PDB file of C-alpha atoms in Angstrom:
ATOM      1  CA  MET A   1    -108.439 164.143 -74.474  1.00 37.88           C
ATOM      2  CA  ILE A   2    -106.363 162.649 -71.446  1.00 39.41           C
ATOM      3  CA  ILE A   3    -106.598 158.667 -71.968  1.00 39.23           C
ATOM      4  CA  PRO A   4    -105.978 157.109 -68.699  1.00 40.57           C
ATOM      5  CA  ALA A   5    -104.948 153.618 -69.113  1.00 43.84           C
ATOM      6  CA  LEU A   6    -104.403 149.936 -66.982  1.00 43.69           C
ATOM      7  CA  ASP A   7    -102.494 147.373 -67.688  1.00 45.49           C
ATOM      8  CA  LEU A   8    -103.890 144.305 -66.400  1.00 42.97           C
ATOM      9  CA  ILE A   9    -102.887 140.743 -65.410  1.00 42.28           C
ATOM     10  CA  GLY A  10    -105.017 137.857 -64.293  1.00 42.42           C
ATOM     11  CA  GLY A  11    -106.997 140.609 -62.571  1.00 43.57           C
ATOM     12  CA  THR A  12    -103.844 142.514 -61.054  1.00 42.51           C
ATOM     13  CA  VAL A  13    -103.256 146.146 -61.901  1.00 42.41           C
ATOM     14  CA  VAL A  14     -99.405 146.141 -63.139  1.00 42.91           C
ATOM     15  CA  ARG A  15     -96.839 148.456 -63.650  1.00 41.13           C
ATOM     16  CA  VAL A  16     -94.226 147.579 -67.071  1.00 37.70           C
ATOM     17  CA  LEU A  27     -93.984 144.523 -63.433  1.00 38.16           C
ATOM     18  CA  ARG A  28     -95.007 145.963 -60.205  1.00 39.47           C
ATOM     19  CA  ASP A  29     -98.202 144.912 -58.333  1.00 37.90           C
ATOM     20  CA  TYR A  30    -100.633 147.736 -58.098  1.00 38.23           C
ATOM     21  CA  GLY A  31    -103.206 145.768 -56.334  1.00 39.78           C
ATOM     22  CA  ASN A  32    -106.213 143.925 -57.741  1.00 42.13           C
ATOM     23  CA  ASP A  33    -108.795 146.858 -57.641  1.00 44.93           C
ATOM     24  CA  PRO A  34    -108.861 148.105 -61.249  1.00 45.00           C
ATOM     25  CA  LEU A  35    -112.888 148.916 -61.118  1.00 43.17           C
ATOM     26  CA  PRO A  36    -112.284 151.169 -58.257  1.00 44.26           C
ATOM     27  CA  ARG A  37    -109.508 153.018 -59.971  1.00 42.91           C
ATOM     28  CA  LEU A  38    -111.062 153.217 -63.329  1.00 39.81           C
ATOM     29  CA  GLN A  39    -114.310 154.572 -62.027  1.00 37.48           C
ATOM     30  CA  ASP A  40    -112.151 157.314 -60.411  1.00 37.48           C
ATOM     31  CA  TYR A  41    -110.642 158.702 -63.348  1.00 37.57           C
ATOM     32  CA  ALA A  42    -114.090 158.326 -65.218  1.00 36.97           C
ATOM     33  CA  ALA A  43    -115.374 160.853 -62.057  1.00 38.68           C
ATOM     34  CA  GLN A  44    -112.534 163.220 -62.560  1.00 37.60           C
ATOM     35  CA  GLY A  45    -113.443 163.881 -66.194  1.00 33.44           C
ATOM     36  CA  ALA A  46    -111.750 161.137 -68.404  1.00 37.59           C
ATOM     37  CA  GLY A  47    -114.047 160.943 -71.748  1.00 35.69           C
ATOM     38  CA  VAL A  48    -112.104 157.380 -72.611  1.00 36.02           C
ATOM     39  CA  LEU A  49    -109.800 154.727 -71.196  1.00 35.94           C
ATOM     40  CA  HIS A  50    -107.675 152.319 -72.263  1.00 34.60           C
ATOM     41  CA  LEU A  51    -107.102 148.618 -71.048  1.00 35.06           C
ATOM     42  CA  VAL A  52    -104.169 146.278 -72.099  1.00 39.60           C
ATOM     43  CA  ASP A  53    -105.046 142.840 -71.395  1.00 39.44           C
ATOM     44  CA  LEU A  54    -101.459 141.533 -70.432  1.00 37.84           C
ATOM     45  CA  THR A  55    -102.670 138.257 -70.044  1.00 39.35           C
ATOM     46  CA  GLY A  56    -104.475 137.408 -73.419  1.00 40.48           C
ATOM     47  CA  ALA A  57    -101.312 138.918 -75.174  1.00 41.20           C
ATOM     48  CA  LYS A  58     -99.424 135.797 -73.857  1.00 47.02           C
ATOM     49  CA  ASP A  59    -102.372 134.023 -74.603  1.00 49.88           C
ATOM     50  CA  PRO A  60    -105.858 135.108 -76.329  1.00 51.21           C
ATOM     51  CA  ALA A  61    -106.989 131.755 -75.129  1.00 51.81           C
ATOM     52  CA  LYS A  62    -107.377 133.206 -71.657  1.00 49.31           C
ATOM     53  CA  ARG A  63    -108.532 136.722 -72.536  1.00 50.64           C
ATOM     54  CA  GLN A  64    -109.985 138.192 -69.957  1.00 49.95           C
ATOM     55  CA  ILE A  65    -113.392 138.595 -70.989  1.00 47.45           C
ATOM     56  CA  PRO A  66    -115.262 138.300 -67.841  1.00 44.02           C
ATOM     57  CA  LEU A  67    -113.475 141.064 -66.131  1.00 46.53           C
ATOM     58  CA  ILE A  68    -113.501 143.307 -69.196  1.00 48.02           C
ATOM     59  CA  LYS A  69    -117.141 142.892 -69.185  1.00 49.83           C
ATOM     60  CA  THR A  70    -117.819 144.006 -65.714  1.00 47.68           C
ATOM     61  CA  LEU A  71    -115.355 146.874 -65.907  1.00 50.17           C
ATOM     62  CA  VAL A  72    -117.053 148.502 -69.292  1.00 51.02           C
ATOM     63  CA  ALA A  73    -120.386 147.976 -67.275  1.00 53.04           C
ATOM     64  CA  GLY A  74    -119.020 149.652 -64.353  1.00 52.01           C
ATOM     65  CA  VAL A  75    -118.108 153.079 -65.847  1.00 53.20           C
ATOM     66  CA  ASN A  76    -119.875 155.357 -68.312  1.00 57.19           C
ATOM     67  CA  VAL A  77    -117.228 156.250 -70.668  1.00 57.10           C
ATOM     68  CA  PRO A  78    -116.191 154.127 -73.760  1.00 56.26           C
ATOM     69  CA  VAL A  79    -112.763 151.646 -73.168  1.00 57.35           C
ATOM     70  CA  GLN A  80    -110.345 151.222 -75.373  1.00 53.42           C
ATOM     71  CA  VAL A  81    -109.023 147.198 -75.174  1.00 52.33           C
ATOM     72  CA  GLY A  82    -105.981 145.846 -76.418  1.00 52.04           C
ATOM     73  CA  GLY A  83    -103.731 142.899 -75.941  1.00 51.90           C
ATOM     74  CA  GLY A  84    -103.317 139.228 -78.465  1.00 55.03           C
ATOM     75  CA  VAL A  85    -106.097 140.841 -81.070  1.00 50.54           C
ATOM     76  CA  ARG A  86    -105.305 138.359 -83.681  1.00 51.69           C
ATOM     77  CA  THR A  87    -108.275 137.094 -85.387  1.00 51.96           C
ATOM     78  CA  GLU A  88    -111.908 138.508 -86.531  1.00 49.44           C
ATOM     79  CA  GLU A  89    -112.976 136.214 -83.534  1.00 53.11           C
ATOM     80  CA  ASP A  90    -110.977 138.183 -81.195  1.00 54.19           C
ATOM     81  CA  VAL A  91    -112.457 141.667 -82.295  1.00 53.79           C
ATOM     82  CA  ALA A  92    -115.450 140.635 -82.057  1.00 55.52           C
ATOM     83  CA  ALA A  93    -115.650 139.168 -78.780  1.00 54.12           C
ATOM     84  CA  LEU A  94    -114.139 142.292 -77.650  1.00 50.46           C
ATOM     85  CA  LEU A  95    -116.708 144.308 -78.814  1.00 47.46           C
ATOM     86  CA  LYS A  96    -119.699 142.008 -77.705  1.00 46.93           C
ATOM     87  CA  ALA A  97    -118.272 142.090 -74.002  1.00 45.14           C
ATOM     88  CA  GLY A  98    -118.957 145.795 -74.325  1.00 47.29           C
ATOM     89  CA  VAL A  99    -115.524 147.587 -75.460  1.00 46.72           C
ATOM     90  CA  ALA A 100    -116.024 150.463 -77.686  1.00 46.74           C
ATOM     91  CA  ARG A 101    -112.700 150.340 -79.946  1.00 46.10           C
ATOM     92  CA  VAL A 102    -110.877 147.528 -79.932  1.00 50.42           C
ATOM     93  CA  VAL A 103    -106.571 148.008 -80.448  1.00 49.91           C
ATOM     94  CA  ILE A 104    -104.702 146.104 -83.043  1.00 54.15           C
ATOM     95  CA  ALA A 105    -101.063 146.019 -82.551  1.00 53.17           C
ATOM     96  CA  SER A 106     -99.119 143.345 -84.434  1.00 51.23           C
ATOM     97  CA  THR A 107    -101.442 142.117 -86.394  1.00 53.45           C
ATOM     98  CA  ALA A 108    -101.803 145.678 -87.989  1.00 52.62           C
ATOM     99  CA  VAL A 109     -98.359 145.466 -88.990  1.00 54.09           C
ATOM    100  CA  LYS A 110     -98.383 141.767 -90.025  1.00 54.64           C
ATOM    101  CA  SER A 111    -101.459 141.151 -91.724  1.00 56.10           C
ATOM    102  CA  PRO A 112    -102.981 144.528 -93.827  1.00 54.11           C
ATOM    103  CA  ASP A 113    -104.761 142.747 -95.872  1.00 55.25           C
ATOM    104  CA  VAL A 114    -107.001 140.969 -93.286  1.00 58.00           C
ATOM    105  CA  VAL A 115    -107.273 143.914 -90.955  1.00 54.72           C
ATOM    106  CA  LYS A 116    -108.728 146.331 -94.183  1.00 56.88           C
ATOM    107  CA  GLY A 117    -111.153 143.608 -93.653  1.00 58.93           C
ATOM    108  CA  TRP A 118    -112.034 144.064 -90.424  1.00 57.41           C
ATOM    109  CA  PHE A 119    -112.581 147.987 -91.036  1.00 57.72           C
ATOM    110  CA  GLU A 120    -115.142 147.080 -93.669  1.00 54.33           C
ATOM    111  CA  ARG A 121    -116.844 144.894 -91.255  1.00 56.65           C
ATOM    112  CA  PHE A 122    -116.566 146.377 -87.825  1.00 58.77           C
ATOM    113  CA  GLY A 123    -116.240 150.211 -89.320  1.00 58.12           C
ATOM    114  CA  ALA A 124    -113.208 152.382 -88.139  1.00 59.86           C
ATOM    115  CA  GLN A 125    -114.632 154.030 -85.175  1.00 61.13           C
ATOM    116  CA  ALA A 126    -114.668 150.563 -83.742  1.00 64.70           C
ATOM    117  CA  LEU A 127    -110.555 150.232 -84.308  1.00 62.10           C
ATOM    118  CA  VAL A 128    -107.620 151.506 -82.926  1.00 62.42           C
ATOM    119  CA  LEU A 129    -104.191 150.919 -84.823  1.00 60.27           C
ATOM    120  CA  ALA A 130    -100.980 150.826 -82.256  1.00 60.52           C
ATOM    121  CA  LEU A 131     -97.694 151.373 -83.640  1.00 57.62           C
ATOM    122  CA  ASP A 132     -94.725 151.215 -82.276  1.00 57.16           C
ATOM    123  CA  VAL A 133     -92.223 153.605 -83.943  1.00 57.22           C
ATOM    124  CA  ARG A 134     -88.221 153.595 -83.688  1.00 56.73           C
ATOM    125  CA  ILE A 135     -86.482 156.783 -85.327  1.00 55.45           C
ATOM    126  CA  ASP A 136     -83.509 155.289 -87.193  1.00 54.22           C
ATOM    127  CA  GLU A 137     -80.121 156.587 -88.418  1.00 54.87           C
ATOM    128  CA  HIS A 138     -81.651 158.000 -91.348  1.00 57.11           C
ATOM    129  CA  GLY A 139     -84.780 159.923 -89.178  1.00 56.72           C
ATOM    130  CA  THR A 140     -87.229 157.493 -90.817  1.00 58.82           C
ATOM    131  CA  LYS A 141     -90.018 156.618 -88.469  1.00 59.62           C
ATOM    132  CA  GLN A 142     -89.544 152.660 -88.619  1.00 59.56           C
ATOM    133  CA  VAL A 143     -92.292 150.621 -87.154  1.00 62.55           C
ATOM    134  CA  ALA A 144     -91.611 147.654 -84.835  1.00 59.98           C
ATOM    135  CA  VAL A 145     -94.291 145.059 -83.891  1.00 64.34           C
ATOM    136  CA  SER A 146     -92.345 145.697 -80.058  1.00 61.71           C
ATOM    137  CA  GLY A 147     -89.837 146.913 -78.274  1.00 61.06           C
ATOM    138  CA  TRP A 148     -87.662 143.649 -78.381  1.00 61.92           C
ATOM    139  CA  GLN A 149     -87.856 143.041 -81.816  1.00 61.24           C
ATOM    140  CA  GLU A 150     -86.374 144.238 -84.861  1.00 62.57           C
ATOM    141  CA  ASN A 151     -87.946 146.902 -87.120  1.00 61.58           C
ATOM    142  CA  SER A 152     -90.674 145.258 -89.598  1.00 60.85           C
ATOM    143  CA  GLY A 153     -89.381 147.079 -92.628  1.00 63.93           C
ATOM    144  CA  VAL A 154     -92.296 149.675 -93.140  1.00 64.97           C
ATOM    145  CA  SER A 155     -92.492 153.248 -92.213  1.00 63.17           C
ATOM    146  CA  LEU A 156     -94.986 154.669 -89.891  1.00 63.39           C
ATOM    147  CA  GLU A 157     -96.309 156.774 -93.058  1.00 62.96           C
ATOM    148  CA  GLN A 158     -96.151 153.516 -95.296  1.00 59.26           C
ATOM    149  CA  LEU A 159     -98.119 151.853 -92.863  1.00 58.97           C
ATOM    150  CA  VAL A 160    -101.181 154.614 -92.774  1.00 57.88           C
ATOM    151  CA  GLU A 161    -101.405 155.185 -95.935  1.00 57.97           C
ATOM    152  CA  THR A 162    -102.036 151.603 -96.340  1.00 55.33           C
ATOM    153  CA  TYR A 163    -105.209 151.921 -93.663  1.00 55.03           C
ATOM    154  CA  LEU A 164    -106.506 155.017 -95.267  1.00 54.10           C
ATOM    155  CA  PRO A 165    -108.314 153.648 -97.905  1.00 50.30           C
ATOM    156  CA  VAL A 166    -110.758 151.362 -95.661  1.00 53.69           C
ATOM    157  CA  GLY A 167    -111.156 155.186 -93.340  1.00 50.66           C
ATOM    158  CA  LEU A 168    -108.412 154.689 -90.469  1.00 50.29           C
ATOM    159  CA  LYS A 169    -109.574 157.725 -87.981  1.00 48.90           C
ATOM    160  CA  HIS A 170    -107.775 156.239 -85.008  1.00 50.69           C
ATOM    161  CA  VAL A 171    -103.872 155.356 -84.537  1.00 47.18           C
ATOM    162  CA  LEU A 172    -102.212 155.159 -81.228  1.00 48.47           C
ATOM    163  CA  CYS A 173     -98.329 155.782 -81.864  1.00 48.19           C
ATOM    164  CA  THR A 174     -95.410 154.849 -79.130  1.00 47.14           C
ATOM    165  CA  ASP A 175     -91.996 155.841 -79.631  1.00 47.90           C
ATOM    166  CA  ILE A 176     -89.855 153.211 -78.543  1.00 48.01           C
ATOM    167  CA  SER A 177     -86.465 154.678 -79.591  1.00 45.06           C
ATOM    168  CA  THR A 181     -89.684 161.539 -71.202  1.00 43.22           C
ATOM    169  CA  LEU A 182     -91.544 164.102 -73.672  1.00 42.66           C
ATOM    170  CA  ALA A 183     -90.570 167.272 -71.760  1.00 45.22           C
ATOM    171  CA  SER A 185     -87.511 166.108 -76.275  1.00 47.66           C
ATOM    172  CA  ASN A 186     -88.193 166.771 -79.511  1.00 48.94           C
ATOM    173  CA  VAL A 187     -92.003 166.124 -80.125  1.00 53.08           C
ATOM    174  CA  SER A 188     -91.378 166.787 -83.713  1.00 52.65           C
ATOM    175  CA  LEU A 189     -92.694 162.877 -84.550  1.00 50.24           C
ATOM    176  CA  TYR A 190     -95.631 163.976 -83.638  1.00 51.56           C
ATOM    177  CA  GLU A 191     -96.110 167.472 -85.142  1.00 53.85           C
ATOM    178  CA  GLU A 192     -95.183 165.428 -88.646  1.00 56.36           C
ATOM    179  CA  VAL A 193     -97.558 163.162 -88.464  1.00 57.26           C
ATOM    180  CA  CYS A 194    -100.789 165.056 -87.162  1.00 56.38           C
ATOM    181  CA  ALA A 195     -99.576 167.803 -89.970  1.00 56.27           C
ATOM    182  CA  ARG A 196     -99.233 165.022 -92.763  1.00 56.52           C
ATOM    183  CA  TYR A 197    -102.705 162.904 -91.866  1.00 57.90           C
ATOM    184  CA  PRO A 198    -104.930 165.616 -90.378  1.00 60.38           C
ATOM    185  CA  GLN A 199    -107.859 163.229 -90.975  1.00 61.39           C
ATOM    186  CA  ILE A 200    -106.835 160.569 -88.630  1.00 61.19           C
ATOM    187  CA  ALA A 201    -106.675 161.233 -84.664  1.00 60.69           C
ATOM    188  CA  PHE A 202    -103.573 160.322 -83.194  1.00 56.12           C
ATOM    189  CA  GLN A 203    -102.918 159.388 -79.767  1.00 57.11           C
ATOM    190  CA  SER A 204     -99.633 159.266 -78.085  1.00 55.66           C
ATOM    191  CA  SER A 205     -97.965 156.781 -75.689  1.00 54.28           C
ATOM    192  CA  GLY A 206     -95.063 156.714 -73.394  1.00 57.30           C
ATOM    193  CA  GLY A 207     -92.826 159.272 -71.969  1.00 55.35           C
ATOM    194  CA  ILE A 208     -95.555 161.041 -69.936  1.00 55.90           C
ATOM    195  CA  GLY A 209     -93.426 160.948 -66.288  1.00 56.41           C
ATOM    196  CA  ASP A 210     -94.782 164.051 -65.071  1.00 54.78           C
ATOM    197  CA  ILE A 211     -97.327 167.024 -66.140  1.00 54.03           C
ATOM    198  CA  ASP A 212     -94.937 168.909 -68.016  1.00 51.68           C
ATOM    199  CA  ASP A 213     -94.610 166.062 -70.150  1.00 52.91           C
ATOM    200  CA  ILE A 214     -98.382 166.587 -70.969  1.00 51.99           C
ATOM    201  CA  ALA A 215     -97.715 170.429 -71.663  1.00 52.49           C
ATOM    202  CA  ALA A 216     -95.178 169.346 -73.731  1.00 53.07           C
ATOM    203  CA  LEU A 217     -97.792 167.739 -76.312  1.00 54.66           C
ATOM    204  CA  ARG A 218    -100.291 170.790 -76.645  1.00 58.26           C
ATOM    205  CA  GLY A 219    -100.449 172.000 -79.870  1.00 56.26           C
ATOM    206  CA  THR A 220     -98.458 169.206 -81.559  1.00 55.48           C
ATOM    207  CA  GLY A 221    -101.882 168.360 -83.118  1.00 57.19           C
ATOM    208  CA  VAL A 222    -101.658 164.640 -81.237  1.00 56.83           C
ATOM    209  CA  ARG A 223    -105.675 164.245 -80.414  1.00 57.02           C
ATOM    210  CA  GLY A 224    -105.278 161.657 -77.455  1.00 53.90           C
ATOM    211  CA  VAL A 225    -102.754 161.637 -74.720  1.00 50.68           C
ATOM    212  CA  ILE A 226    -102.173 157.755 -73.061  1.00 49.17           C
ATOM    213  CA  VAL A 227    -101.280 158.355 -69.224  1.00 49.28           C
ATOM    214  CA  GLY A 228    -100.539 155.386 -67.427  1.00 51.77           C
ATOM    215  CA  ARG A 229     -97.723 154.666 -65.182  1.00 52.82           C
ATOM    216  CA  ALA A 230     -97.519 158.484 -64.233  1.00 51.60           C
ATOM    217  CA  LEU A 231    -100.916 157.986 -62.395  1.00 47.83           C
ATOM    218  CA  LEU A 232    -100.114 154.938 -60.789  1.00 45.24           C
ATOM    219  CA  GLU A 233     -97.144 156.842 -59.350  1.00 47.41           C
ATOM    220  CA  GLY A 234     -99.102 159.297 -58.350  1.00 48.32           C
ATOM    221  CA  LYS A 235     -96.794 162.202 -59.997  1.00 51.92           C
ATOM    222  CA  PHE A 236    -100.363 163.908 -60.493  1.00 50.59           C
ATOM    223  CA  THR A 237    -104.346 163.100 -60.996  1.00 48.68           C
ATOM    224  CA  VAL A 238    -106.535 162.791 -64.066  1.00 50.80           C
ATOM    225  CA  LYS A 239    -108.567 166.477 -63.210  1.00 53.55           C
ATOM    226  CA  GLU A 240    -104.861 167.804 -63.265  1.00 49.93           C
ATOM    227  CA  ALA A 241    -104.063 166.252 -66.339  1.00 48.91           C
ATOM    228  CA  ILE A 242    -107.142 167.274 -68.081  1.00 48.86           C
ATOM    229  CA  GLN A 243    -106.698 171.250 -66.843  1.00 45.17           C
ATOM    230  CA  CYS A 244    -103.153 170.877 -68.559  1.00 47.51           C
ATOM    231  CA  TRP A 245    -104.176 169.493 -71.791  1.00 47.09           C
ATOM    232  CA  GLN A 246    -107.074 171.978 -72.007  1.00 44.42           C
ATOM    233  CA  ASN A 247    -105.370 175.027 -71.382  1.00 44.36           C
TER     234      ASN A 247
END
């Protein structure tokens, strides 16, 4: 599937920052109207301070579409996960905490279930060709490979992993082919590198299950409908 995405700061839709207006709901509704089966939101306000989590907006956005939304941004505690789910979020995207405190996050799998959680990992390919996990693009590697981290969570039934290569795709997509083949029981999502429609074509056949598309839609390079048509053929 194609997974259209928006980044939100204080109610404003932004491109990672250019202001694309304060109308996230009509945008999301039109993504869904074109056939999207899943949507993705990053709460940048919440990421900078969980106390300011945009729960009221998220409630409104989720209520206003007919498809599941996965939401990330400053998900640090069990209470954060629960609050998002209570607001009507289908899946909570766990990023830095999944690298930082695996034993704690494994407990979240046991409480909420693997269908409710997406693990989002930034990956750098290093000098040796190892897939190094990092918690952000501006921090050093954390000393764990993507494979090692995935295998940490397999025993609690990990099902959804979102991988961003921080080291466009129309490149060598071996990263995705490799990991998808190694863990066929996990549905991998790809993020980044989508600059035009050919980039979506490049991921077909890699085994990647979901393709997150954000800025290319905002920039009017192609539509959700065209993306889905490409992805499905």
